Each structure stands twice: as structure tokens, then as C-alpha cells.
């Protein structure tokens, strides 16, 4: 740009106010609409070209320090982050060449607007802005300075990347005035005359506050209270998302960097409703994102709303303890546990009973209690972290559905809890209001790869190293040989099989009454932990565990009987010989 401290400084200043009138004049008629050079080609048929196709498989690869000259990439564009783009400022000198460049006249760029350089040979927001007003078909009265400021922000940032990211495909054909203006009118054609609306637009504008499955990008890591949240832009407007601890941690870690794209089914518009407009959005307003509903998208993909609102099933193995709730798991029901009637105490907490413990305390009895049908499940994928889905107030038509050995795809099955006590790989799915169940077929082998049916524990097993029961739990049937109720805690109930092979059961629950000696007991859901070495293995009675003097279950009776037999033919000296054993099975005294 010329250094004519005057004249060139005027030639312009004149061309401007001369223009200021043009724009001003528009204000005198009903400007019939007039689409731009882009909204008209893209709106036409003409085989379009995906960003991906264009590039042709390859992915976003950095410049190359050098070689960037080999394709020629403005060291200037190469200098724009997602927060300075609102500035940048083209160097008309670098884009027009002395001639007309020297003449105040200015530059009539695509569509017809006049891009009129700044005194010091520049081009920016307030500059391109006026140039859109000077454009045909545009009605200055419909677009704020802020408006073009913002829309100017992304357009450069995008083009900036595209040249810097695919220095060969878009080498040096994207960032320049002709485009930033050819496009600024587009967004105007798009948004103003055709009314199309960005996702965050309808969203924030409450004309579709759906806030479902968006493909947003990170435009900045807000530094406020040392790392507040982040700014999410969908190509047209931005918002600060309310993040969850699992996610936020990722920002810190440098896991979630700026410019990256996210997919998110969660989506919640926390803060302020009322229904605003993207730019005039209340500071008291965040777009909640949840780490178990969100994930990184394909470089290309496309910003905004996605196609289907059907939650993507993600491996159960993952999911964060406090990582927001999940929308879809493709589990394979391991076990099913006994329905519990949990009465909600008065001073707090609750009390858990059984189909039976209820009756008792049901007559023994305003109430206030809810049934809880828990079940242990594992992801259809591989590994298997065996979670414990908890359906509350279950629908009667449910029991007949969810059934061990079967593959189901549960929805919005979340709240995801647990973490206390030991370790940390303790998630905890919980059916929710919107939750739903969808049954899916399983390949014999694949199931037999995750699911090991409910067998009957043969005591001799509790003593084999290699023994590792499914879900570290087991079902049993044996002869009670003695119940010990030491003062304090830890009742015991020693059992026995026809072979007088012993085992022990430490109770967590209460002693099911009919459990005295000579009683063939049938147990279901006993918590198993490694017991070889143990002179007499221990099994623990959980809250899921059960004890029946006369089981309703078929195979149990099949056994409780079948054993009640083989023992009889030995009763001529059993329960005694048996006691005589466990009697010394507490020996190894010193001396």
C-alpha cells in the first residue's frame, strides 16, 4: 500500500463516506433479496465435493516449518489461533498489487461490495462489515457489527486451518478477501434471507432447545475461577459448556485441545432459558456436556446437529464414576438377583427386605418402600467389567423380559455411581425414567465367551487352585452341621456334603430362621473368594444371597433330595461323625 501521507489517505476517506451514502441509501427501499455466488452454486445441483473427498483420504497434517513455502502458506495465516481470528487483518498490499491499490478507489470484491482498505492498508471486521453493507441484496439494517465480527471470526479460522492443515489441497486458495466476503454474504444468504439456523442457534434460541446430538468444536479453554470450562463453537456461534470432572480433567491433561471436535448426545442448556439469540446470550448460561455422552469426532464429520438421536452404544468398561450418565450399553445379562423391597427409613437411609422379609414386617406393621430388581451385566464387546444395573420400581412386564444368558441393549441406563471402599473400577448403572430395553441376538460362541450358566458348586471345588467361579459367586446345597452366633458380629453356618467335605458361610444378612442343624440348606448367590489352603473354605452371605429350607427351584430339590438320600445310607453314623470332624477341624494347636 502507498505511503502517500496524504491523498491516498484521502482518496480512501472519500471513497468511504461516498459509500457511507450508498449504504445509507439502501435504507430508502424494500431491497428485494439477492443470493450470493455461493448460496447459488451450492443451492444448485452440481455434484458437490466432500471435504474428505477433496483431500482424498489423507488427514490434517501440520505445515512442515519449511516446505510451507513449497506450497506457499502465508506466514500470516499460519499465525491465527481461534481467538485472534476476529482480527488477523489482511494486507491489501499482499493481495492486490500497486495499481488500484494506490488509487483510493478501493476494491470491489465478489458479489459487489467494496472492500475499502484502512488508512494503513488493512482489512478487518469493521472493514469487511461495511463491505457487506455495500454488497447488493444485503440490507445493512439486518446485521449488527457484532454479527459480522463473529461470523468473520470463524470464516478466517476455518480457511486458516484448511490451508495450514492441507497445505497442498487448499495451499493458498482459501484465506483472502474475495472469500471472506464471498462467504460472509453466504452466511447472510443462509441465515438472513433463507432463515436456516445454526444448531446452537435453534438451541440457544429455544426454537429447538432439544440439545441432543451435536458435533461442536472447541474454540477456547476459558481461564477464569485455573481452568474454568471451554468454549464450544458450531461454526456459527459459541457457548461455554458446563463440564463434568471426568471431562474437565481431560482439558487439564491436555487431552481435549482447542480446535478438536466432539460428538455429544447428553447436551443440557444449564443456566438461563427465556429464549435469547446466540450473540445476546446471558452470561449466566452454559451448555452442559457429559463425559459419558461425549466423544471426539472424525476430523471431517460436520459441525452441528448429527443424524440420529439414537444413543451410540459405548463400552461399559469405560464410563466414569462421576462421569455423567450413559445413554446406551450393549450388555449381556450375567446374573439376575432376588427382588428387594427397600423401605425408606424416617431419619434417613433405607432398609432392605426380601419377598418374604416384607410379609413379616408387612403384618408386623405410612409404609413407603420401593422394590429394586438388580442384575449383574457385562458389555457384549470383550474384557467385561461386569456392572450391576439397578432397575427401581420395575414394571411387571420386565421380569419376563430381562433374563440371564440374553443380550440386551439398555438405554439411558445411567446415573453411574459407586467408588467407595476399595479400588475404583466400580461403576453402577441404574435404570432411569426414559430408560428402555432392546433385546439383541447372540452368537452361541460369543455368549459362551462371556456367559457361564448357573451351575451348582461341588465343595471339592472350593479347594482347587484353578477354581474361579463366574462372577465370583456360587449357588449351593448342603447339610448344616452347626451354627455359631458369636457376640458382636459374624454369624456362621458350617455346611457339609455327603462326603463330609466341609465349607463355611459368614453371614452378612440375618439368619433365615429355619437354618438349624440337620437342615438341608439350599443357597443361591453366595459371594466367593479364593479358599484353597483353608482347612475349610469360606463363602460369604451377601444381600443378594438366599437361604431356603425347601427351595422352590427345581434342580435344587433335584439335589437337596438326591443328597438327603446318599447321606441317609450313612446316617447310621453321620451328623455325629460329621460333628466329630469339624470338631477337630479347628485344630492345629500349639505344642
Amino acid at each position: 500500500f502507498p505511503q502517500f501521507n496524504k491523498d491516498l489517505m484521502s482518496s480512501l476517506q472519500n471513497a468511504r463516506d461516498l459509500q457511507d451514502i450508498r449504504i445509507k441509501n439502501k435504507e430508502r427501499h424494500h431491497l428485494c433479496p439477492q443470493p450470493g455466488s455461493l448460496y447459488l452454486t451450492k443451492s444448485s445441483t452440481l455434484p458437490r465435493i466432500s471435504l474428505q473427498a477433496a483431500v482424498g483420504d489423507s488427514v490434517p497434517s501440520a505445515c512442515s516449518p519449511k516446505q510451507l513455502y513449497m506450497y506457499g502458506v502465508s506466514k500470516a495465516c499460519i499465525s491465527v489461533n481461534s481467538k485472534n481470528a476476529e482480527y488477523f487483518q489482511f494486507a491489501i498490499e499482499d493481495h492486490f498489487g500497486k495499481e488500484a491499490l494506490c488509487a483510493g478507489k478501493g476494491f470491489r470484491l465478489a458479489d459487489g461490495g467494496w472492500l475499502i482498505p484502512s488508512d494503513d492498508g488493512k482489512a478487518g471486521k469493521e472493514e469487511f462489515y461495511r463491505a457487506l453493507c455495500d454488497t447488493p441484496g444485503v440490507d445493512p439494517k439486518l446485521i449488527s457489527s457484532v454479527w459480522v465480527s463473529n461470523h468473520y471470526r470463524w470464516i478466517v479460522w476455518k480457511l486458516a486451518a484448511m490451508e495450514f492443515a492441507f497445505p497442498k489441497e487448499f495451499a493458498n486458495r482459501c484465506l483472502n478477501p474475495e472469500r471472506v466476503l464471498l462467504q460472509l454474504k453466504y452466511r447472510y444468504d443462509v441465515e438472513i434471507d433463507n432463515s436456516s439456523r445454526s444448531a446452537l442457534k435453534k438451541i440457544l434460541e429455544r426454537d429447538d432447545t432439544a440439545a441432543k446430538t451435536l458435533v461442536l468444536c472447541v474454540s477456547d479453554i476459558i481461564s477464569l475461577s485455573k481452568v474454568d470450562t471451554i468454549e464450544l463453537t458450531d461454526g456459527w456461534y459459541a457457548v461455554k459448556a458446563q463440564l463434568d470432572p471426568p471431562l474437565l480433567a481431560l482439558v487439564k491433561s491436555g487431552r481435549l485441545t482447542v480446535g478438536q471436535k466432539i460428538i455429544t448426545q447428553g447436551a443440557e442448556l444449564v443456566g438461563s432459558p427465556d429464549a435469547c439469540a446466540p450473540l445476546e446470550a446471558p452470561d449466566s448460561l452454559r451448555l452442559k456436556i457429559s463425559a459419558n455422552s461425549t466423544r471426539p469426532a472424525r476430523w471431517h464429520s460436520k459441525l452441528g446437529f448429527f443424524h440420529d438421536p439414537r444413543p451410540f452404544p459405548l463400552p461399559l468398561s469405560s464410563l466414569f464414576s462421576d462421569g455423567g450418565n450413559v445413554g446406551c450399553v450393549d450388555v449381556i445379562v450375567q446374573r439376575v438377583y432376588p427382588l428387594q423391597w427397600v423401605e425408606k427409613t424416617v431419619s434417613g437411609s433405607y432398609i432392605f427386605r426380601n419377598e418374604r422379609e416384607e410379609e413379616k414386617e408387612a403384618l408386623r406393621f405410612s409404609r413407603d418402600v420401593s422394590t429394586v430388581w438388580k442384575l449383574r451385566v457385562t458389555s457384549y464387546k470383550k474384557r467385561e467389567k461386569s456392572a450391576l444395573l439397578s432397575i427401581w420400581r420395575p414394571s411387571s412386564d420386565l421380569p419376563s423380559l430381562l433374563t440371564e444368558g440374553q443380550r440386551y441393549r439398555i438405554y439411558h441406563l445411567s446415573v453411574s455411581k459407586s467408588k467407595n471402599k476399595f479400588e475404583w473400577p466400580s461403576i453402577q448403572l441404574t435404570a432411569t425414567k426414559r430408560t428402555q430395553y432392546q433385546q439383541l441376538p447372540v452368537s452361541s460362541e460369543t455368549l459362551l465367551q462371556l456367559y457361564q450358566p448357573r451351575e451348582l458348586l461341588p465343595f471339592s471345588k472350593l479347594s482347587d487352585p484353578a477354581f474361579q467361579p463366574p462372577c465370583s459367586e456360587v449357588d449351593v446345597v448342603g447339610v448344616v452341621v452347626s451354627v455359631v452366633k458369636p457376640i458382636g458380629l459374624a454369624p456362621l453356618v458350617y455346611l457339609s456334603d455327603e462326603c463330609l467335605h466341609l465349607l463355611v458361610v459368614k453371614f452378612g444378612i440375618d439368619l433365615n430362621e429355619d437354618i438349624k442343624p440337620r437342615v438341608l440348606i439350599a443357597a443361591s448367590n453366595l459371594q466367593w473368594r479364593p479358599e484353597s489352603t483353608s482347612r475349610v473354605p469360606t463363602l460369604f452371605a451377601g444381600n443378594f444371597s438366599v437361604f431356603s429350607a425347601s427351595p422352590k427351584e427345581a434342580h435344587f430339590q433335584e439335589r437337596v433330595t438326591n443328597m438327603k438320600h446318599a447321606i441317609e445310607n450313612i446316617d447310621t453314623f453321620y451328623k455325629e461323625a460329621e460333628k466329630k470332624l469339624i470338631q477337630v477341624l479347628k485344630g492345629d494347636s500349639p505344642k
Binding site: S50, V59, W157, K158, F164, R173, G259, L314, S317
Partner: protein, 45 residues
């Protein structure tokens, strides 16, 4: 011929009104469509 920047479906040409997810977040693989990301590149200079 070069990429007709006009008929090129842009990263921002939103759809007014209408394996595609990626397992674990704590993933630190080393390839494909989630690797880099045009724009994120620019940021990391």
C-alpha cells in the same frame, strides 16, 4: 483441475434439519480420523 472451492461441501455447511463414536475416552491410540483434526492442528502450530 483443483478443488472447486465452490462445490466443496464445507466443514460448516450445517444441515438445518436432518465406528462413528469411538470406545474409551481415556484412549491414547495413534491413528486415523480422530488422530489430528484440521483446526486443532493450526492451534498446536
Amino acid at each position: 483441475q483443483p478443488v472447486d472451492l465452490g462445490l466443496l461441501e464445507e466443514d460448516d455447511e450445517f444441515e438445518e434439519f436432518p465406528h462413528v463414536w469411538e470406545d474409551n475416552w481415556d484412549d491414547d491410540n495413534v491413528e486415523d480420523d480422530f488422530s489430528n483434526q484440521l483446526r486443532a492442528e493450526l492451534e498446536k502450530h
